[PDB]
Amino acid sequence: MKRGFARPTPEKPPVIKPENIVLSTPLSIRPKLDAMRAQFMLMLDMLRETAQESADSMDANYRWFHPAPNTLAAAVGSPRMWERKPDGKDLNFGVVRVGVGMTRPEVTWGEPQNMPTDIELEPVTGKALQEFGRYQSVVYNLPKMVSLLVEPWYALVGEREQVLGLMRAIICQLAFSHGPDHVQMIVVSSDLDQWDWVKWLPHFGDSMVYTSVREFAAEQAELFAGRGSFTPRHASSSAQTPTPHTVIIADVDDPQWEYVISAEGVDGVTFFDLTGSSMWTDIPERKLQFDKTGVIEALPRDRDTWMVIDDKAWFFALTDQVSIAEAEEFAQKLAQWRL
Amino acid sequence: PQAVVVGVMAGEGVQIGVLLDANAPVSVMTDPLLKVVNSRLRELGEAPLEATGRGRWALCLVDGAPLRATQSLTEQDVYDGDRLWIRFIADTERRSQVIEH
Amino acid sequence: QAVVVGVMAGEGVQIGVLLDANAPVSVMTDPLLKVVNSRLRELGEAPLEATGRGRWALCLVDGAPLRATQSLTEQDVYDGDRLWIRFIADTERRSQVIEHISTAVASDLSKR
């Protein structure tokens, strides 16, 4: 028996403020020239203060949408729960916090006009304007994210304590931030002794932890085979896709998985391979690799469109992760609530 | 030895004497504990305890330092006659700030 | 109708159980003690056992026993709550006395 819960109109999010900024054009090559140099430095600091303020608006905005996973339980009752909406305007539907890392500020810098030729640039302002662009072009420690709607699957490759650390952090972020009518979740696994805590959560219900692919094929695949192949969407597209997104977790290493994977999936689904089987791990655009320290690497993706910008894999996120105990503690608190 | 009696402080100062399970780990208790202090303050005519933004609930010593969430209340040096505090501790995660010079 | 709780048992084993919604606590506290005992042996724990005049009943985390005559739905129990099974000897007497002082000064007086 469950408590009712009606969701309000959302609380207003902290607004992000853009900044279109045109840089300090360098000095071109005694008591006079220091005054020229010293003025150039001080104009630069005032751009820095313009940058720092715009960066603070972005920190407030992203944390307000994607909290740290341990804070989620205390929040559980509040109208911040089950807040996210599918209807086109909400950019954060299908987006899940996987850790912390780098992101590119909402400043948009204009190149200094009349740039002196390489031999004509002055030494002090030259290096100063160069480092400013190198470091102030990124803001450290923001919540890094994955989109369900962008790729058919995400291979998780690493030792078990790490892969299962990440996967439970993902599961409860979805569970806190997205309602049961918008996200449904399935496990196929042999280590049922890891998926016991999942008893409680309502998102693991249906209108559902399974032991092997032959079993999943009969109950779940009879539904999920029914149509399609993957088709990368975006926020505006989100209005059209039918309401429950499925996340499916494959943990068994069965060869019977070849049918859905070589067929390029289905729409309405997203797989995480926890095993590292070769059928999943052959596409770098779709692979998350774990260092022993839990640092994940993947191909770089665009902040605004998630489209891939490069074919070399690079730093992505420092993983945050929850134990079986903490998951079940969160899981029971949520089990209390219904529509 | 199966239970220990301790006083729990709640918001702005009510103490309630409680007899706890001495060997379950503390994180198993702090949620249902909050239910009881609230039920009692509501009848007594006080204003209940509530969360603000981002943070977590902790059960701490009167010194404020929280107890390890995974260990047993007997495994921690908490005896019959001690007292405890149920408290909200805020989230400290925020962006990093870099200055080049 | 049903509700689900963590029923704690000996030395802090978390167990989860399925209980009825509307039948009162007294009419179930006997049979529930079997299934907690039936499981306890499979973990290799001793079943619940104590001596002296008294009984077993269900409790909240502060030692308070529930009302023996009412639904868990008449008390406020809902899915995912936690409860204790406990030995209530004849000697048992409880304080039930609450006092008001600034929580800010007690904590600080420990070091002031």
Residue numbers in the entry:
A (entry chain C1): 1 to 29, 97 to 274, 285 to 416
B (entry chain D8): 18 to 118
C (entry chain D7): 19 to 130
What does the paper say about this structure?
At the cytoplasmic side of the complex, EccC5 has a stalk helix that connects its second TMH to the first NBD (which is also known as the DUF domain). This NBD is bound to the cytosolic domains of inner and outer EccD5, which—in turn—are bound to EccE5 at the periphery, together forming a ‘cytosolic bridge’. Further classification of the extended state reveals EccC5 to be more heterogenous beyond NBD1, which suggests that NBD1 is more stably bound to components of its own protomer. In the contracted state, the flexible arms of EccC5 extend from the interface between the DUF domain of EccC5 and the cytosolic domain of inner EccD5.
Specialized protein transport systems—known as type VII secretion systems (T7SSs)—are central to the virulence of this pathogen, and are also crucial for nutrient and metabolite transport across the mycobacterial cell envelope. Mycobacterium tuberculosis encodes five homologous, but functionally distinct, T7SSs that are designated ESX-1 to ESX-5. These systems translocate a number of effector proteins across the unique and impermeable diderm cell envelope. Here we reconstituted the ESX-5 T7SS of M. tuberculosis H37Rv in M. smegmatis to obtain a structural view of the entire T7SS membrane complex from this human pathogen.
